[PDB]
Design a protein around this ligand. Structure first.
Ligand SMILES: CC(=O)NCc1cccc(Br)c1
Ligand SMILES: CC(=O)NCc1cccc(Br)c1
Ligand SMILES: CC(=O)NCc1cccc(Br)c1
Ligand SMILES: CC(=O)NCc1cccc(Br)c1
Lengths: 237, 300
């Protein structure tokens, strides 16, 4: 069935699973034509496929070339997403395939289901959670590689950097989702927070600053403040 | 004109023959139905007065033999049987006919309703869905489940309808995933028409049989099959024009014949709204859309 508040801990048990987010696969800028009409220009996109237990991000970049000559691009996007996830599963050894794939938007179930008919023992599941993976394009390194890409390409990052060495996957997933929620509610503030102290560097192979445990607490608090705050300035409360 | 004689009517029962029904009182002098039009398949069906649970009955074709009904007080139902001795059957029928102990099939001469609901049903074909090869007639009741239903318990008593599953490898070619799911023409035309049925008559015949078991027996599995076979055509961008025109006649008489107070259950909102207003063929079912809107505009 669906993943929600009540069955939240299943993400961190020992059954392999993947979150698929498709919100950044088909991206456009909307602009005006010489005749004063409106047209779109597609820019590179990505699929966000995340093992919440290990932190692994299988980033498939979606090069604007894949749309050339195609119609109904928002609908193709979902199927293209599904085609790519099924390819990734097929590419993986059997003991490394997920037992579940959880899609963050319901419109991805039928495409993924159809593309995974060859894997009847992989459960395709929606969720009731309002997860913030759309903001993954606010992470500089992530955004950079997508926009620089000149051809289709699969990029790998641990979205948890080295956190698992010190904290559990539950705690790491909560940090990630709080970081991503902040970035989605006010990207500027969120980033000002993350970088205010020039002495905390981001390692070449990491996406996030090298905070100490105690610096993470402070950070995590400031992010909560932000999300509440903006919820005020968004609801005048 | 053929006859289904009844040995007697020991229990109070509502008898239906095709779209017609009448009440028979317990031990009323009643010895059958005469003047049944030759050349069509027919159904004779039963709902006991005491237990409206279980509608049941028998599909049959009089060209295939002499059939009659005797109540079985052990198993509790009106059973169809075959009389192998023609002379003795004719003689028994004749005496019942002379004593006027039979009701008359009311073949309205303007009316082509039953023809239009059964144009593609056959008894050689009906026996490939309801398996019971020692009899030339076929029993159906409300609780019989379909083969597909059993996949999702007694196989001998199942309705072996043609399994249709839109999210199946049968339905979906590797590499055309989006193509074949959003336009089901490959599955309609190549897998089902060319591969399984052989022709659209065969497709229409199972669709007709499916609907009639739904309406007469409240057989849920048949209702599911009727809607599935509609939806498969409605969801194919490419359908022979003759098939579309015939599908519009077929559904028209199905919708015209449905009891008004049973539409709420035997008609699937999603399938019909999709078929009439969103699908490829939303413009090809003029007669069916016209009657649906004038008669059941609530569902839509
Ligand atoms: C995303 C990241 O750092 N993954 C580790 C990894 C490397 C190679 C294969 C696989 Br499966 C995962
Ligand atoms: C009872 C018996 O002598 N024969 C069975 C039967 C045959 C034909 C018609 C009817 Br009604 C009953
Ligand atoms: C509905 C209609 O015309 N006649 C009902 C009927 C009554 C009695 C026997 C039979 Br057969 C049919
Ligand atoms: C073998 C098979 O089911 N053919 C389709 C069919 C044709 C005609 C009537 C019926 Br009932 C079923």
């Amino acid at each position: 069935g669906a993943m929600n508040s009540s069955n939240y801990a299943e993400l961190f048990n020992n059954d392999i699973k993947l979150f698929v987010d498709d919100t950044n696969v088909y991206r456009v800028t909307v602009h005006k034509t010489f005749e004063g009409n409106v047209a779109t220009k597609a820019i590179n996109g990505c699929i966000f496929t995340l093992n919440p237990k290990t932190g692994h991000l299988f980033l498939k970049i979606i090069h604007t070339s894949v749309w050339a000559g195609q119609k109904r691009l928002s609908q193709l996007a979902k199927w293209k997403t599904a085609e790519e996830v099924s390819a990734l599963v097929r590419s993986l050894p059997k003991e490394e395939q997920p037992k579940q794939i959880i899609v963050t938007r319901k419109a991805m179930l039928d495409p993924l289901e159809v593309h995974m008919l060859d894997f009847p023992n992989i459960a395709i599941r929606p969720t009731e959670l309002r997860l913030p993976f759309s903001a993954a394009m606010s992470i500089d390194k992530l955004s950079d590689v997508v926009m620089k890409a000149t051809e289709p390409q699969m990029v790998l990052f641990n979205i948890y950097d080295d956190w698992l060495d010190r904290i559990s996957s539950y705690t790491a997933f909560s940090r990630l989702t709080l970081l991503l929620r902040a970035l989605k509610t006010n990207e500027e503030s969120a980033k000002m927070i993350l970088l205010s102290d020039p002495t905390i560097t981001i390692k070449s192979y990491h996406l996030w600053p090298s905070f100490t445990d105690e610096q993470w607490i402070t950070i995590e608090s400031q992010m909560r403040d932000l999300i509440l705050t903006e919820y005020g300035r968004k609801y005048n409360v | 004109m053929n006859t289904v004689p009844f040995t007697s009517a020991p229990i109070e029962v509502t008898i239906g023959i095709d779209q017609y029904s009448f009440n028979v009182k317990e031990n009323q002098p009643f010895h059958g139905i005469k003047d049944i039009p030759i050349g069509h398949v027919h159904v004779i069906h039963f709902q006991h007065a005491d237990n409206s649970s279980m509608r049941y009955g028998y599909w049959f074709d009089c060209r295939m033999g002499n059939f009659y009904i005797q109540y079985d007080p052990k198993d509790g139902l009106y059973k169809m049987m075959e009389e192998r001795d023609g002379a003795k059957f004719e003689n028994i029928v004749h005496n019942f006919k002379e004593r006027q102990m039979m009701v008359s099939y009311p073949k309205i001469d303007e009316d082509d309703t039953w023809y239009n609901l059964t144009e593609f049903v056959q008894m050689d074909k009906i026996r490939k869905i309801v398996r019971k090869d020692e009899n030339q007639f076929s029993y159906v009741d409300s609780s019989m489940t379909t083969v597909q239903e059993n996949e999702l318990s007694d196989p001998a008593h199942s309705l072996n309808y043609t399994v249709i599953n839109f999210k199946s490898r049968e339905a979906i070619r590797p590499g055309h995933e989006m193509e074949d799911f959003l336009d089901k023409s490959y599955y309609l035309n190549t897998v089902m028409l060319q591969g399984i049925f052989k022709n659209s008559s065969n497709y229409f015949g199972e669709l007709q049989f499916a609907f009639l078991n739904a309406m007469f027996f409240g057989n849920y599995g048949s209702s599911l099959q009727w809607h599935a076979m509609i939806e498969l055509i409605c969801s194919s961008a490419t359908v022979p024009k003759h098939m579309l025109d015939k599908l519009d006649e077929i559904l028209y008489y199905q919708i015209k014949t449905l009891p008004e107070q049973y539409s709420d259950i035997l008609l699937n909102e999603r399938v019909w709204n999709i078929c009439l207003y969103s699908s490829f063929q939303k413009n090809s079912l003029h007669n069916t859309e016209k009657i649906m809107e004038n008669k059941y505009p609530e569902l839509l």
